[PDB]
Design a protein around this nucleic acid. Structure first.
Lengths: 126, 244, 299, 236, 223, 237, 267, 215, 63, 83
RNA sequence: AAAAUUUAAAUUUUUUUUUUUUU
């Protein structure tokens, strides 16, 4: 996750999986701003309650999301979605790196072991 | 010590001009139809300028965009063959030039009806070809063509002229030889009025002449926008008489 | 990086001029009070006009002259803005317009005008001369920088001294500083610039074809004052009543008869402030010499 | 029997119905009864032109029509657009005028027609039906607060071009009539835009239909059967 | 201890401080948190951009490193998680040298840290600890060690040293070292001796400072 | 002689206390410890408050940090559709305000305000890390149309702690002496903004010059004569 | 590039020009050029001037200023310097065309620097100074044409004193009114393009867009010469090429080249 | 002068001195730069002239500009240590470079993706007691090997051969030409200029494919 | 079939009957009136006769 | 040189404060914050030393350890290529 | 004498140091 808008969410592409797991991470350096970046729009986070969408309650900066390509979009970014019960948040550290590692409580929620603190993320089905 | 003769006691200048006289003054309209809808050519003596105007149109970037009015870009091209002695380096970020690039903007922030051209771009292209001194007011008179050359919305004519001072005596329409010889002032004069757009003094001036000095250039400046007008009009007659 | 002001606040000041008021407490044609204070170094000064604060520095060193004028020494003024003095500014934009509007003035105010004898920088012709340097720093803006940097540079030239020199071909003998005294510099004339600040209370046309001159001009725009002004004009003069530069580069249209009537009032202003510098240069050097009297009797 | 026109002229930079013709800065009158419209500004009486153009006095309305300027967009006009950009569900497209027109996402003829209804997946395929620089027939709907206007294709007759060649002209010489598609002997068709944009193509059956499949409205295809006797007749 | 300072002496800027030690006058300015640029943001922590203007000349490479080591020191001073997607531009002005800029940069590096520390207090940004820096030299000929030398003593100095420490618990516990700028010739053995005064002295510096802050700002504070 | 503090001091209170956190203190997300991280004076909330106390540091600033349920004054800077662009302080980040967060909430009804207006609004919802949001009309207004767009007036910038004293404090002597001359309006913005409109611009300049001077001198006891003198400075005429 | 065209054209344009009875969009013969206008001798401060007008309104002016120099301390006796309006110095098409014409006018390749020679010690530094107002083309072969006329419109002041400065080392002297024309044989440049099995001459911008690849062929002295470069116009349609087609174009240039030259060798 | 670098005191000057069919040969190496994804190393030595140069790949990098259907190539020529070729002399070659690879690379495989090519004219001997024209064909070879190392879709091992101030680039084992470069030489020597270029191309491409397939 | 549909009336109050009825019934219904439009991009549309005529002249893509 | 401090959480079976030198490998260069860089001539000499302490504390002994590791890594390279 | 009749206006960032023009 790169930046959180009220409109939308912005990420950069890092790693592509494959079909019949088998992956392909990009070997690029993001510190150049090199890599391909994409955009998740906030209504495209999920389809259940797709109108009254609260974006902060699913994402924070720097976090890992199993997301599906929607389409190409522009040349600048991508059209992207997470709108499934198996998709969404993979992993982040607490308070965006300011704390320890966090585990998805449900498919729908996430906590942290040592802390006793939870946060709302649109977690993936594990 | 100059081995030459600045101004005669018999009233004459280098070509024999009087102190209240002009060079040959020639404009032209629609010099480049295939290039832009603003295209005008100046000869004021050997000051020769190609003047080009682009707009009102879409920007290159949405960053450079306003939702209120137009923008105005000034791009000055001084060639290395503009003078007698060929200049070595290029000028394209020279801090002398950028001043004028600032200058014509604020001179022309206030003729353009900016509000009625929003979200669009006006670009003014300059090509200085042959340089004869009096260089500042040479430009402005070329500008006033080029905006009318597309017929952009405006208030008025705007005239420009450098007028020099040999010791007591004003000199309408100096040249670069005279420019390096004495003190000069250029006036950016608006229409028929007594109000100024441009006023720029580099040289050192005794105070007491200056009111009189300023009182000189208006009659010159009024004869400028005079000669611009009919010269456009005789062009303007040439359209519809052969269009229709 | 954009200053945002309400149009409600825009009308407010514009009303205050329409009832002959301005927010600072000065008159329209009144200038701020100037605090000049020197550091211990020569060519060291802190100059302060209320809110606007500046600092500059004069130095010199040895170099060869150009081929261009092989007679004369070398000199240039740096005026690099730091965004310290206000968050509007880029980190050292030498290509911004207002910077150039600060630049070319002081370029013409000093260099093309020649207050300073560059020929008195010629140590030896074509071999070794002086490279005199003027770094202008801005501290905090309330406008009047180009008038402040007008002053603070010319303040600095009347406080710098250069050390002692002896020539034998290549054997060029720069002496120790404290045995052989530093030597001040030659000023041909003292220029003082004046900012003029312009406000149409009307539309364009009543300035254009409204024959009635109705345009208010004030001195030393404060920060909020400066953000709404319509034309920009600076003149510069001396004590010998000659006009150094004038620059109205566009903006609002403006009557000629105003400008002479403007520039006369400049004269009485700048003269009093000029002499205030002149005493303080003396009086500090008097305080230098009275403390030099408080030194040799002490030592 | 030549290659190039080389004719020479050396020693010179250059070779060198009545109505009111007015200038900017110029007074027209100060009768207060007149109304003040385009090309006109004023101070309470003083009627002041702003362009090089003509006084138009309409019955109490005085206004100044210029002679020089870009194309003026007006509604209901039949012009040609070159695709500038793609927006959110918007497109940008050159008129040749001051600014781009805009073109709504559902403003276009869908393949299969209205039985194809709306879909949010259509914005995932904006580039499918349209992309940059392409030429088409467009119908001027209505405007904005400034004078920038928009387009649509409310017919089969409007749509993306093929089967020929573009040319362009000044907008002035194109005369107005009640009709704009024209069919010429040589089995070919001019599509005169108003704005100054001119497309030629071979006469279609739909063109023939004007005077007596639907899935091909974003194709880059032509009729494959194009004779040179078509092609050389285009150039004439 | 011929040091002295000013707080809150600019106008349009968030944090401002004049630090004046024995010979060098340096003012620092702090503006933040404010709108960051496009190329400058961090999704998590606080972005920092630092400008030092010399007294003489313009910004070159000699300035650049004194900037960049000063970048390293401030980064743990700032509670950087508190201001995501933000920017604080901080700017320092060298006004007085007090040291040969051609030959040295030592005192200024001590000075500017001691300058910028106080303008942040003016700025009132979430910080972590307390700090101090001093210049320390060792004489070539005498082979002795002076805390806070002079430039003529720098001429006969063998090795020039700047120590930056992190002070907590009443500023008393050395929480960490920030910077140790060892320059000139030195060995093992001098170094632990070289800390051992600056172990005391920077605390002795801050012991003055703790007072000064409250004296300047509690009348700016309300009761 | 206070509960003065530095970032990096010993925190005074025992750890086993139920304590609502005030600003100025920071809890570690990494090591769970809690420390004072700003400069100034602590003020301990006294006991009895449900057995739950509260710490807060008096710190000084001018650069306002957007926080919730806070009355600020803003400037309309852009018409991002559905949702305004509004700023609160120059060079800071812009704020987003709904077009619908308004006391006659009506989604078919699009309101009227234009770029460059002054509006009174309260911070509704603002994460530390997210695009912050405000409201004029609120639920915490409780259907109150008490905020709103302003008319012309005049707005002056001060530092924040002063503006708290304008809001939080009746002992603040300012509103007394000002009411003791003329009658007028006042809007208080926690972004250091103070919007005043009088019946007169003349008194508004008198209102202007005092507040510039008083907040500069920051000596509330002295403000009796200092305020009244500017009237004489206006009544110089 | 300059333009953005539509794909449906791009087929038809690539269709019609790759006809075996090949068809231009304006339908010229395959070896034709387009009509132009040629003006000179109008900047009387210069040693020579030039002004040329394209059919699409592409526009340039090349100036001639001279300078006397020692021809021993300097190698390059002839300098080209180019300006395109609307572009940075740093751009590509600027610098390549700039560096090209220097090679085209190397001092003894097609340039007869003996005619430039003033003394046994001195000669004439010349400045090919170029200002392009506008282009819609790969502009280069236009630009040579005005320069050819520019050298045919250039007069130089007359030597008075002698020219052997090894012993006596005289400072050379010129008369103040008497100028002589520079006798010179300047070269010419032609833009080519390859479509399918056809080779058009003077590619217009549409023709320049659709091409598989193109050439630049240096003409001088009534023949083909160097510098010769294969050259891309676009980069969306770049295809390779049979060499006999490359061998075809050379005489295809050459048996129509001097007729263009004689049209301009016409005074 | 330049306030961004250390260029010494100005009045110094560098030091001055005065006077008091053959084989070409290669040494080709890949996979030695970890910043890149494609690297290639080239040694060359021929008869008075020894030359070494580095070709560097960055791709596919993102394009902040806009949409394209396909890829875009960017090529930089930079002076190394000793030999200083002219600035405008450089980019002309960079122009001539891009034309050939636009008949090589499957850009259609790479929408909205960039290609960065850095060429370091690192060190050259010319001990011989159109000086850039003698180094053209080795560039193309040096690029091709690095572009194979990033593994990008390339149609052909295309190469150029040189015959005495003349550069001709081939494909299809020489059965088509993809890039033509000519300086002064003779007149109508073209037919021999076919040959000696072709056989070096016939040499070089075999040297290239040995460098990879044997690894 | 995700299609749009026009329900016509000569009277506002005819629609006001049918609107709140269908608004209770299916909800996702746009109302178009000279007095009040509600929910312009809804799937179902209820509007008076001339509005169709008006948006048949200038060609609403709503159609 | 680099000195780090360790999490109990991060272990995989096959305080705690570790010195690393010969630093490389972006992940290292991101995450090491207290660092040491040293110049030294092989007879125990020292041209400079460079401490940026931004992560861990610094012991007096990691100092001496790095000093012990200084005079090795330098002196080998003095003797490695014998120029 | 009733009855009623009409609208719809556009949102979130890509660039190369300052000489130097004829007493």
């Amino acid at each position: 996750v790169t930046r959180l808008s009220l409109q939308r969410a912005n990420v950069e592409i890092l790693a592509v999986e494959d079909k019949p797991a088998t992956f392909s991470v990009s070997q690029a350096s993001s510190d150049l701003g090199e890599t391909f970046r994409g955009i998740i729009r906030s209504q495209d986070v999920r389809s259940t309650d797709r109108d009254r969408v609260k974006v902060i309650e699913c994402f924070k900066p720097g976090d890992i999301v199993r997301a599906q390509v929607l389409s190409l979009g522009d040349g600048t970014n991508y059209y992207l979605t997470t709108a499934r019960n198996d998709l969404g948040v993979v992993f982040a550290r607490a308070a965006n790196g300011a704390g320890g590692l966090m585990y998805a409580t449900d498919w729908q929620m996430m906590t942290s072991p040592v802390t006793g603190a939870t946060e709302k993320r649109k977690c993936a089905k594990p | 010590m100059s081995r030459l003769e600045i101004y005669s006691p018999e009233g004459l200048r280098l070509d024999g001009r009087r102190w209240n006289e002009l060079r040959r003054f020639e404009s032209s309209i629609n010099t480049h139809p295939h290039a832009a809808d603003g295209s005008s050519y100046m000869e004021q003596g050997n000051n020769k300028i190609i003047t080009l105007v682009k707009g009102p149109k879409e920007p290159r970037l949405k960053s450079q965009m306003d939702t209120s009015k137009a923008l105005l870009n000034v791009s000055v091209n001084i060639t290395k063959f503009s003078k007698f002695e060929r200049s070595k380096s290029s000028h394209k970020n020279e801090r002398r030039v950028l001043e004028i690039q600032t200058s014509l903007v604020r001179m022309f922030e206030k003729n353009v009806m900016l509000n009625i051209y929003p979200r669009t771009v006006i670009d003014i292209e300059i090509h200085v070809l042959e340089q004869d001194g009096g260089i500042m007011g040479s430009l402005i008179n070329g500008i006033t063509l080029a905006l009318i050359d597309a017929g952009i919305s405006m208030f008025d004519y705007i005239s420009g002229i450098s007028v020099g001072l040999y010791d007591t005596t004003p000199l309408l329409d100096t040249n670069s030889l005279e420019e390096n010889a004495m003190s000069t002032v250029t006036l950016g004069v608006v229409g028929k009025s007594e109000k100024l757009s441009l006023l720029l003094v580099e040289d050192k001036i005794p105070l007491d002449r200056l009111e009189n000095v300023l009182a000189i250039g208006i009659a010159g400046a009024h004869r400028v926008r005079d000669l611009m007008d009919e010269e456009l009009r005789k062009h303007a007659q040439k359209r519809v008489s052969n269009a229709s | 990086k954009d200053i945002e002001i309400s149009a409600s606040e825009s009308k407010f000041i514009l009303e205050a001029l329409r009832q002959n008021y301005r927010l600072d407490g000065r008159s329209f044609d009144q200038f701020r009070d100037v605090e000049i204070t020197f550091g211990k170094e020569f060519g060291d000064v802190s100059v302060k006009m209320g809110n606007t604060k500046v600092h500059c520095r004069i130095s010199c060193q040895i170099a060869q002259p150009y081929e261009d004028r092989p007679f004369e020494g070398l000199f240039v003024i740096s005026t690099e803005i730091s965004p310290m003095a206000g968050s509007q500014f880029e980190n050292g934009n030498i290509t911004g317009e207002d910077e150039v509007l600060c630049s070319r003035i002081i370029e013409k105010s000093v260099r093309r005008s020649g207050a300073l004898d560059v020929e008195g920088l010629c140590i030896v012709a074509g071999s070794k001369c002086w490279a005199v340097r003027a770094d202008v720093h801005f501290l905090d803006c309330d406008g009047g920088f180009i008038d402040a940097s007008c002053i603070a540079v010319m303040a600095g030239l009347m406080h710098f001294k250069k050390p002692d020199i002896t020539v034998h071909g290549e054997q060029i003998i720069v002496h120790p500083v404290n045995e052989r005294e530093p030597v001040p510099l030659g000023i041909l004339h003292i220029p003082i610039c004046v900012t003029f600040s312009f406000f149409n209370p009307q539309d364009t046309e009543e300035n254009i074809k409204g024959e009635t001159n109705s345009e208010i001009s004030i001195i030393d725009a404060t920060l909020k004052e400066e953000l709404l002004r319509d034309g920009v004009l600076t003149v510069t003069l001396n004590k010998n009543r000659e006009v150094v530069q004038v620059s109205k580069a566009g903006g609002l249209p403006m009557d000629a008869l105003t400008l002479m009537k403007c520039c006369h009032e400049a004269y009485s202003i700048i003269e009093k402030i000029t002499d205030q510098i002149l005493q303080l240069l003396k009086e500090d050097s008097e305080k230098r010499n009275k403390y030099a009297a408080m030194l040799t009797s002490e030592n | 029997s030549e290659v190039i026109t080389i004719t020479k002229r050396n020693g010179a930079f250059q070779n060198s119905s009545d109505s009111q013709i007015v200038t900017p800065g110029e007074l027209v009158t100060d009768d207060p009864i007149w109304m003040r419209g385009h090309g006109t500004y004023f101070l309470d009486n003083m009627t002041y032109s702003s362009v090089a153009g003509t006084v138009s006095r309409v019955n109490r309305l005085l206004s100044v029509i210029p002679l020089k300027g870009r194309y003026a967009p007006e509604t209901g006009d039949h012009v040609v657009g070159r695709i500038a950009e793609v927006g959110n569900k918007r497109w940008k497209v050159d008129i040749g005028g001051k600014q781009h027109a805009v073109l709504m996402l559902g403003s276009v003829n869908l393949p299969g027609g209205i039985l194809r209804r709306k879909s949010e997946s259509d914005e995932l395929q904006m580039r499918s039906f349209l992309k940059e620089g392409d030429l088409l027939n467009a119908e001027v709907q209505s405007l904005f607060q400034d004078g920038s206007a928009s387009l649509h294709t409310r017919s089969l007759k409007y749509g993306k071009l093929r089967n020929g060649m573009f040319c362009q002209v000044p907008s002035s010489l194109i005369v107005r009539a009640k009709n704009h598609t024209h069919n010429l002997p040589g089995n070919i068709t001019v599509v005169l835009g108003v704005n100054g944009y001119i497309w030629l193509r071979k006469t279609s059956q739909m063109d023939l239909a004007r005077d007596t499949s639907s899935w091909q409205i974003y194709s880059d295809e032509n009729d494959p059967s194009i004779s040179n006797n078509i092609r050389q007749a285009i150039c004439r | 201890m011929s040091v002295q300072a000013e707080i809150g002496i600019l106008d349009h800027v968030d944090g401002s401080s004049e630090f004046v030690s024995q010979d060098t006058k340096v003012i620092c300015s702090v503006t933040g948190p404010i709108e960051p640029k496009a190329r400058q943001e961090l999704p998590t922590q606080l972005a920092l951009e630092i400008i030092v203007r010399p007294a003489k000349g313009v910004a070159t490479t000699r300035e650049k490193v004194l900037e960049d080591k000063l970048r390293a020191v401030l980064t743990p001073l700032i509670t950087r998680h508190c201001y995501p997607r933000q920017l604080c531009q901080i700017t320092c002005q060298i006004l007085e040298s007090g040291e040969d800029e051609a030959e040295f940069s030592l005192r200024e590096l001590s000075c500017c840290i001691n300058a910028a520390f106080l303008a942040l207090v003016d700025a009132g940004i979430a910080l972590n600890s307390m700090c101090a820096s001093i210049p320390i030299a060792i004489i070539k000929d005498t082979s002795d060690i002076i805390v806070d030398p002079t430039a003529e003593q720098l001429k006969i100095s063998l090795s020039v040293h700047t120590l930056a420490l992190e002070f907590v618990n009443g500023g008393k516990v050395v929480k960490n070292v920030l910077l140790l700028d060892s320059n000139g010739d030195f060995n093992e053995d001098q170094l632990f001796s070289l800390l051992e005064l600056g172990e005391q002295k920077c605390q002795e510096l801050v012991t003055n400072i703790r007072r000064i802050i409250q004296d300047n700002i509690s009348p700016r504070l309300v009761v | 002689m206070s509960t003065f503090i530095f970032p990096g001091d010993s925190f005074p209170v025992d750890p086993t206390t139920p304590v609502k956190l005030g600003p100025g203190i920071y809890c570690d997300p990494n090591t769970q410890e809690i420390r004072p991280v700003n400069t100034g004076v602590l003020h301990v909330s006294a006991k009895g408050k449900s057995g739950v106390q509260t710490a807060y540091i008096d710190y000084s600033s001018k650069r306002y940090i957007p926080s919730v349920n806070d009355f600020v004054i803003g400037v309309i800077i852009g018409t991002f559709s559905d949702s305004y662009k509004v700023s609160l302080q120059n060079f800071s980040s812009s704020v987003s305000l709904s077009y619908m967060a308004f006391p006659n909430a009506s989604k078919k009804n699009r309101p009227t305000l234009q770029v460059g207006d002054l509006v009174y609004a309260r911070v509704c919802t603002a994460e530390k890390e997210l695009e912050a949001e405000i409201e004029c009309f609120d639920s915490t207004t409780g259907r109150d149309a008490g905020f709103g767009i302003l008319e012309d007036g005049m707005i002056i910038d001060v530092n924040l702690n002063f503006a708290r004293q304008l809001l939080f404090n009746n002992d603040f002597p300012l509103l007394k002496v000002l009411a003791a001359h003329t009658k007028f309006e006042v809007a208080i913005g926690l972004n250091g903004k103070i919007w005043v409109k009088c019946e007169e611009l003349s008194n508004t300049l008198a209102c202007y010059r005092t507040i510039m001077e008083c907040c500069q001198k920051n000596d509330t006891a002295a403000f009796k004569d200092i305020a009244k003198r500017q009237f004489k400075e206006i009544l110089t005429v | 590039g300059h333009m953005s065209l539509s794909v449906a054209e791009k087929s038809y344009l690539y269709d019609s020009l790759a006809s075996t009875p090949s068809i231009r969009p304006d339908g010229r013969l395959p070896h034709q050029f387009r009509p132009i206008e040629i003006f000179t001798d109008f900047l009387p401060s210069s040693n020579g001037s030039s002004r040329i007008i394209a059919s699409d309104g592409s526009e340039c002016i090349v100036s001639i200023k001279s300078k006397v120099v020692d021809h021993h301390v300097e190698n390059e006796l002839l300098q080209v310097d180019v300006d395109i309006a609307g572009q940075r110095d740093d751009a590509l098409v600027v610098e390549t065309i700039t560096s090209l014409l220097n090679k085209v006018l190397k001092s003894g390749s097609g340039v007869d620097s003996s005619k430039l020679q003033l003394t046994k010690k001195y000669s004439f530094k010349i400045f090919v100074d170029v200002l392009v107002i506008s282009s819609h083309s790969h502009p280069i072969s236009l630009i040579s044409f005005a320069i050819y006329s520019a050298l045919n419109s250039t007069y130089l002041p007359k030597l008075i004193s002698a020219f052997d400065d090894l012993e006596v080392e005289e400072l050379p002297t010129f008369h103040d009114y008497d100028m002589v024309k520079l006798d010179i044989n300047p070269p010419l440049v032609f833009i080519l393009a390859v479509v399918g099995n056809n080779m058009l001459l003077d590619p217009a911008a549409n023709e320049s867009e659709v091409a598989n690849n193109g050439l630049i062929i240096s003409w001088s002295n009534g023949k083909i010469t160097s510098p010769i470069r294969s050259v891309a116009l676009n980069d969306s349609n770049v295809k390779s090429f049979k060499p006999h087609l490359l061998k075809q174009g050379l005489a295809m240039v050459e048996k129509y080249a001097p007729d263009v030259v004689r049209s301009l060798e016409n005074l | 002068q330049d306030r961004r670098r250390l260029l010494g005191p100005a009045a110094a000057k560098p030091m001055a001195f005065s006077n008091t069919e053959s084989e070409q040969e290669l040494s080709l190496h890949t996979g030695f730069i970890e910043n890149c994804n494609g690297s290639a190393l080239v040694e060359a030595r021929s008869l008075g002239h020894q030359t070494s140069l580095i070709s560097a790949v960055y791709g596919p990098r993102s394009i902040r500009g806009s949409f394209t259907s396909q890829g875009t190539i960017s090529i930089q020529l930079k002076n190394g240590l000793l030999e200083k070729y002219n600035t405008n002399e450089l980019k002309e070659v960079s122009s001539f470079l891009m034309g050939i690879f636009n008949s090589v690379v499957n850009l259609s495989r790479y929408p909205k993706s960039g290609i960065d090519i850095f060429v370091y004219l690192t060190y050259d001997k010319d001990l011989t007691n159109s000086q850039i024209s003698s180094l053209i064909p080795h560039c193309i070879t040096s690029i091709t090997l690095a572009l194979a190392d990033a593994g990008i879709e390339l149609v052909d091992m295309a190469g150029a051969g040189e015959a005495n101030g003349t550069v001709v680039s081939f494909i299809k084992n020489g059965e088509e030409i993809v890039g033509f470069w000519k300086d002064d030489g003779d007149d109508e020597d073209l037919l021999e200029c076919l040959d000696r270029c072709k056989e070096q191309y016939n040499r070089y491409r075999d040297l290239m494919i040995s460098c990879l397939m044997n690894q | 079939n995700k299609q749009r549909v026009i329900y016509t009336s000569p009277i506002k109050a005819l629609s006001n009957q049918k609107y709140r009825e269908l608004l209770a019934e299916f909800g996702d219904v746009g109302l178009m009136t000279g007095d009040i439009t509600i929910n312009p991009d809804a799937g179902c549309l209820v509007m008076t006769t001339e509005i169709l005529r008006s948006m048949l002249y200038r060609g609403s893509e709503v159609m | 040189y680099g000195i780090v401090e360790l999490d109990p959480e991060c272990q995989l079976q096959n305080l705690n404060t570790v010195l690393i030198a010969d630093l490389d490998t972006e992940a290292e260069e991101t995450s090491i914050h207290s660092t040491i860089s040293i110049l030294a001539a092989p007879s125990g000499n020292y041209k400079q030393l460079t401490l940026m302490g931004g992560g861990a504390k610094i012991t007096p002994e990691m100092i001496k350890r790095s000093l012990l590791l200084s005079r090795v890594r330098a002196d080998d390279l003095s003797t490695r290529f014998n120029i």
